[PDB]
Amino acid sequence: SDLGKKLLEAARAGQDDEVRILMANGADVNAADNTGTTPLHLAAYSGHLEIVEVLLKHGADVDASDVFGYTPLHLAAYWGHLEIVEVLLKNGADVNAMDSDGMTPLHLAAKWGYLEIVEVLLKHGAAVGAQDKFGKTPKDLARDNGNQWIYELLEKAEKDLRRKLLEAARAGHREEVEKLIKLGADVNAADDVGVTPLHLAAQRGHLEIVEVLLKCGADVNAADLWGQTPLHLAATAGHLEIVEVLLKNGADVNARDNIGHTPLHLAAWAGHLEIVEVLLKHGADVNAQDKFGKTPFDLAIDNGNEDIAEVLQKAA
């Protein structure tokens, strides 16, 4: 198309008048190059804020991707055009769009050292844990490119993300956790005392958070400072369903904490009968005795939970 190429060339050169005249004469605002480049791509690439706004007003696709997968936001970040980045976000640009190599706008900003653009992409929900085709994150690219201010900025964002996923698990919000998962969250990340989101989820009974994390790759046998597998914390609080899911995904029945207790101990200590039945079905060792020399039968009789001691002897 004749008018199309002229519009592309006008947006790149920064000729607002020609841009307006060509569109006034029927030039498609979303004209496509042979590589998929649109005039918005070239205006955002060149740093022409006025043209960018003009094109968007006339219906420019804010999320157009060329053959390599770059969007106007990729290009604005690639060249460090803060004002354009903001305008593209105001107009509904996908902050977490990925090009062919897995790079997102945050990757590019972190790679080229555009601190102010990093800050803005975060404020608008940029995925901090995204990994490109080469398994590198924006923080990895800041480190490899010697952008230390951005490195510290992104490291603190990962930490803040780590605490939110702990609260959202301790609170019980699936979709609120799921948005953090899609934001690049490390489900296997723990706090200072080795407590993961799967721990706090299995302990408080905010179910279904348990299933997603295990399907995401959360280590079922993650042990905290006290050697507690999430299966331990679920046995005490008395949440049946969670017990099956963990054992359903390779959890260990004979997992021993620092004290030497297994989920069968903690279920016989508390007084949750229906728990021990499930454990016994999975070869839960009734002979296992902790460092106190006590067996799950000893704790069943110490706390006087007779119904438990009875069934423990039938299976012993």
Numbering used by the authors: 12 to 327
Relevant lines from the article:
In this paper, we present a strategy to fuse specific, high-affinity protein binders to obtain multivalent or multispecific scaffolds of predetermined geometry. DARPins are used as building blocks to confer the desired specificity to the construct. A series of rigid connector modules replacing the DARPin capping repeats allow to combine the individual DARPin domains in such a way that their distance and angle can be altered to test different geometries, bringing the binding partners of the DARPins into a defined spatial arrangement. The two helices are not just joined end-to-end, but instead the two domains are made to overlap in such a way that the joining helix is stabilized by contacts with the domain cores along its entire length.
